[PDB]
Amino acid sequence: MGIGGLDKEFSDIFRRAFASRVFPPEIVEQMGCKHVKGILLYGPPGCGKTLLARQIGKMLNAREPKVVNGPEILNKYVGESEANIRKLFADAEEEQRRLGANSGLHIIIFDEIDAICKQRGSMAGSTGVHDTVVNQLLSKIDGVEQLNNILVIGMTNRPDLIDEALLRPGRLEVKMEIGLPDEKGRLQILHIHTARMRGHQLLSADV
Amino acid sequence: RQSIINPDWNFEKMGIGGLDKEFSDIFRRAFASRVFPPEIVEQMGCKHVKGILLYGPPGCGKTLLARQIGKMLNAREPKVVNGPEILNKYVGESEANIRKLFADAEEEQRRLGANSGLHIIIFDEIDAICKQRGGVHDTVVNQLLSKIDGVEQLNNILVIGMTNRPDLIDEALLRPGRLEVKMEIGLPDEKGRLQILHIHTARMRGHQLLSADVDIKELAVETKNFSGAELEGLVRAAQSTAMNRHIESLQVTRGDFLASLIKPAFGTNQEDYASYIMNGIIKWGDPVTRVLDDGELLVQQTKNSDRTPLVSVLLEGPPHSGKTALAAKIAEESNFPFIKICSPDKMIGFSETAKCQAMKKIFDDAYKSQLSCVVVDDIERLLDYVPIGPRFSNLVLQALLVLLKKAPPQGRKLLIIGTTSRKDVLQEMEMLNAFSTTIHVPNIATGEQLLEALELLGNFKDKERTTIAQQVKGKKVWIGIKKLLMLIEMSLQMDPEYRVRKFLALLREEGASP
Amino acid sequence: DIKELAVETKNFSGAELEGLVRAAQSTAMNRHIKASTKVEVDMEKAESLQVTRGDFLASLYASYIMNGIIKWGDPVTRVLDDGELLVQQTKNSDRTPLVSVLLEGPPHSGKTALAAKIAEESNFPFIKICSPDKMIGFSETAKCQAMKKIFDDAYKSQLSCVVVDDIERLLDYVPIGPRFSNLVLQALLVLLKKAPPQGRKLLIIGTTSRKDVLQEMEMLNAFSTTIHVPNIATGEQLLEALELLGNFKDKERTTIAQQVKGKKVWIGIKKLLMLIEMSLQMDPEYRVRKFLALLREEGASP
Amino acid sequence: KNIDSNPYDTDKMAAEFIQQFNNQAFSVGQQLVFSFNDKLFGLLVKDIEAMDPSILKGEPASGKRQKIEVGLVVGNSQVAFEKAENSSLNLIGKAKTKENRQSIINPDWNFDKEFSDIFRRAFASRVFPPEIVEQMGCKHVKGILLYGPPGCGKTLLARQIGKMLNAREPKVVNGPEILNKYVGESEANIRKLFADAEEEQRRLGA
Amino acid sequence: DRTPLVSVLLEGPPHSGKTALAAKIAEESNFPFIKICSPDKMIGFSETAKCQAMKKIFDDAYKSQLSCVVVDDIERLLDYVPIGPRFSNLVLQALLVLLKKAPPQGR
Ligand SMILES: Nc1ncnc2c1ncn2[C@@H]1O[C@H](COP(=O)(O)OP(=O)(O)OP(=O)(O)O)[C@@H](O)[C@H]1O
Ligand SMILES: Nc1ncnc2c1ncn2[C@@H]1O[C@H](COP(=O)(O)OP(=O)(O)OP(=O)(O)O)[C@@H](O)[C@H]1O
Ligand SMILES: Nc1ncnc2c1ncn2[C@@H]1O[C@H](COP(=O)(O)OP(=O)(O)OP(=O)(O)O)[C@@H](O)[C@H]1O
Ligand SMILES: Nc1ncnc2c1ncn2[C@@H]1O[C@H](COP(=O)(O)OP(=O)(O)OP(=O)(O)O)[C@@H](O)[C@H]1O
Ligand SMILES: Nc1ncnc2c1ncn2[C@@H]1O[C@H](COP(=O)(O)OP(=O)(O)O)[C@@H](O)[C@H]1O
């Protein structure tokens, strides 16, 4: 698929998260088990996280993903960041309301999530500036009305600054690490990126 | 008049377990007067209750309860507000949005009187709107107060709220005649866990997709201090693991459950134990044993006593004597369901207030279990002490001293283990008056102990051992365990011929008066 | 009896009374609902419906006084009599609506619990306790705000009693330097002399464990009087306390007396309790020896 | 059931209104129905200013427009179409009229390179034969921004880049010339700009 | 394997040439990751900012498999002056804590 050096990580993801999306529907319904709702990825920049997300999205015949850079989402005026967050779910809500249990899955691709989800202040008078945004996200991900055609993928770099309510078994219960590649991965990457030149015969033998 | 409860409803179909007492209380205080025959109620001249509040820690089933309550009643569909979706940037828009919610109720009241049906409104994360007064938020709160109870009287509404921080809500919204029925959903006990497992494992049992070897009772016994979310996740993960093997005769066995057995939030972390005890424990002398015994005694005191719910005892040690390892070992051997370690290496660059908040979060958190153990290490590093001056942070000291003598809620028990390396300064700080007792950890003081430790570590050969004995048994020594390991590691990098000599030389250079 | 209910209900708002009636009626109705769990049903007994006083009882200090109070000697009676005298003085006087007192003694003497007992026996309608347990991590300004609110709440009653606990912890005192918080001290000193609006009465009780430090701060001139709380000082008294608690039986009591009776002691009750708890954890036939060893190791240093 | 949110060109709808209901009586509060783009609209008259009688006399208006309980549409009358708040029907036209909203809003509270190095990083690819650049499909620069206080230097530079390369006669727009009192015509000038580019790209290819 | 963390201090009179020798040793190590933290690049920073900078460097260092780091002028990072003496405590606490924390297992 054009990604090399993270076979173990993808094997774990496929085993833990997407086993029920391929196993025949009849027995899945016979069990009565829900699907995982989200996953989190963290690591140094430039290691190929977005590429992995897009490939995962393409794998399951999903629709075009919605991808948004974290920062921007926040407005400067009042009662605006929450509206922007809520705008992302209108299509899924409408599609579910129309098609019942047939409606197809949807995608969410948050970016630099740690910039918009921080621990809410428990002490009185020491509340954070952006607690309202976190509250809105918490209400949207899992609320009174159930959505069964959505999947969420968060990317971050500071997993110890994230609010603890986003990691309970109901939200984003799967975690993985994408570290720097080792020698074999470097070799594979070199093959992948030099494939074009090799095909058109610009890769010398002295190289 | 139509009844207010569907004929098909029964408790068993709600799929809620471990909250029998709370559900009975809620029904008693909220629905008794709306199901009793109307004529007697007309003879009592009483109004109906107007609000309910539910609160608690994450993953206990509040939203589930709210939804089921919503679908239990014979009313029409309830209007739902998902968090702060009513705020707006323009003047007077949010107040209008608030007023929109009660229009149908007011209209029906005016039109029909006592024959109207019931209306329900649900607020999620209500703490984002109602805060203690003292401009725009205050106006929103006042509008809500005016609408709920104003000059014109309403009699057919019920409101349900949910929150995670019940201590930040304004006092004027929480009086009788308003949301007055307050309920607490807390962590469940073993029987509730069994009930929950029964709820979530009914369909599988019907279709014989469950192996006969699995015993639900064993699973119930093993999972201590679990909440509902973990109990559901365990089943989901087990099913996924079982399915993975086949990539018709599928069943779920005990092995799958064992392998699956998630890291609960209020549980015990094994990675912490792995990190703080790196090289195991070597019995180089009696004092170790004595220490362990003492620990045993303390544990046995805290588990069975009723008159002493809180105990304290910090431990000292000559630099590099290995206090933290012993403390972690004691904590591991306590066998309590809740264990945590507070260390200063997670607070690099923090200010005073951040550290205070972290400690308060730790403490408070632990306060919700029947048995807790917490370890605080390197007290001098926590206080940011430097001998020149001296200088230090007073606020942290005051916070720790106050926390050292606060009893938990009724019926709960806590144990605290402290570690330090400068006992004289601590005595000077008037901190020893809050601790029940003390234990002493000594250094290595004889050649015999050194020889036993050397044999136990197993680095050098027998001839080198005899050589070491020849020169080291002629006097006494003064060395810590960690420094000894460091010296051995440094020495093993030389050529084989000179090693022993270097060892002795280094020991001759490190030596200092006790 | 409505009059009995009126006597029982002190400091109830109009809404609380309405709520009490509403709760009582709901509880009364709840008897006749039989099978809410299986299927909602009503019984024929609804006709014989009545509201009883048991329902009122159901509808209608443990944290600070945990292990009670035992009369282990004479001083306790003296303290209680002085407290009663002070309460009587504050209730039936017109020329002095504000009076203050300080209770002092050696550390670990259990003074706050005794103050709580005095306050409970005063039988005044309004009693509140200000404790550092609700001010962990607060900044000094917030502490002042909390104190101001607490004192303001007391002017809306005809009779008020307030207790300040662990004064030394409120000031954030440490012997080195020394170093302390000036703002709280200034607030408290100014706040101990403002009389309420004419016709209302207030009493203030304060607990501390180091009188010399407070004396150095020129604080002892603001209080009106002082009371002393002593330690346990004789073996006979220790035997009496042991007898009252009822832990070690006579056979061991004789052996213990044979030793302690010919010596002097210096100890607080709370530490004796902790020693007792530690000693009980050993085997049945080593306990007396450990108790005596711990008692010896304690020390006196009067 | 017919709602959509795209803009309707609505000066047409006013001209059509004047054409269809010419010489008719109209009064305040009156309700009626209208049709455009084969979509149906409900209408409610809210205010009526007469002409100043001077205009009827052939003289400049004083601005003393009387407000009248009933008015007569005549071949030069005009009309405005303000939306009821709840709505999606986007509208424009230009003369369809929308008084400036004068509404308070509350905030939120709280809170370079050498020109040869430029040739290197922007123009090295474009000079080569198509074959080799296609070989590895190099990406190309197409956006350059210059910032600096006012002065002729930037324009002189612009002409120098115009000179050095074998480029067409440059097209230059001075400020927001696209903006037109015909709203909706601002975008039209834009599409007009790239017609020649589209033709050449479609004709000469690479 | 039993001692994954090691420390060493070079001391001598002024102008002896300590920095040069430290750099030479670092060069001769032949490890994949080398970085140098000196106060020359933190001119005008407030104390909190300096703490953040050190934190970033060490956090990045934990991601490699073999790391070696050199700190040049401790007396300049602590802002020490003989009168008093007077200094900033926060940096002292940061250095003291960092000298004992081991990386994750195997690094
Ligand atoms: N006792 C229980 N019986 C049945 N389901 C339970 C129980 N406890 C938890 N759950 C599970 O909890 C899930 C939803 O939890 P929910 O978020 O409603 O709880 P909460 O306490 O409101 O959470 P939070 O405070 O994190 O928002 C449901 O899937 C439900 O199956
Ligand atoms: N029986 C033992 N007693 C003490 N330490 C032991 C024992 N066996 C092994 N050790 C090793 O001793 C080391 C404990 O060092 P640790 O870092 O906890 O020291 P400390 O006294 O807490 O503080 P400091 O590092 O500041 O001197 C660990 O490497 C541990 O494996
Ligand atoms: N006669 C008594 N007087 C006071 N306390 C008594 C008496 N008899 C038993 N007690 C118990 O002794 C304990 C008093 O301890 P408390 O915590 O009040 O001490 P304290 O004065 O705050 O001491 P310190 O702060 O110095 O530890 C309580 O458990 C109380 O119930
Ligand atoms: N063999 C050598 N030993 C020491 N220094 C040498 C040697 N050969 C050359 N030098 C030069 O000596 C100088 C050492 O100066 P440097 O500033 O590193 O000293 P320093 O002890 O770090 O002092 P400072 O506190 O001023 O930084 C360098 O310019 C280095 O090139
Ligand atoms: N293992 C890999 N295989 C293929 N491409 C990779 C790999 N690692 C990185 N890349 C490159 O990373 C570039 C950007 O990827 P992206 O996921 O956006 O990185 P970042 O983590 O910085 O967002 C892509 O152009 C891609 O070619």
Residue numbers in the entry:
A (entry chain A): 218 to 424
B (entry chain B): 205 to 338, 345 to 457, 471 to 484, 488 to 740
C (entry chain C): 425 to 484, 499 to 740
D (entry chain F): 105 to 215, 224 to 318
E (entry chain A): 532 to 638
Please quote the paper that reports this structure.
SNARE (soluble N-ethylmaleimide-sensitive factor (NSF) attachment protein receptor) proteins drive membrane fusion at different cell compartments as their core domains zipper into a parallel four-helix bundle. After fusion, these bundles are disassembled by the AAA+ (ATPase associated with diverse cellular activities) protein Sec18/NSF and its adaptor Sec17/α-SNAP to make them available for subsequent rounds of membrane fusion. The disassembly requires multiple ATP hydrolysis events in the presence of Mg2+; as few as six ATP hydrolysis events are sufficient. The side-loading and side-release mechanism explains how Sec18/NSF can disassemble SNAREs with constrained topologies.
We observed similar states, including a coordinate split of the D1 and D2 rings, for the mammalian homolog NSF after processing substrate. We observed a similar coordinated opening of the D1 and D2 rings for the mammalian homolog NSF after processing substrate. We observed heptameric states of Sec18 and NSF, split-open hexameric states of Sec18 and NSF and a transition between split hexamer and heptamer of Sec18. We found that both could process the species-ortholog SNARE complex, albeit at different rates, further corroborating the interchangeability of NSF and Sec18. Sec18/NSF transiently forms a split-open conformation of both D1 and D2 domain rings in the resting phase with no substrate.
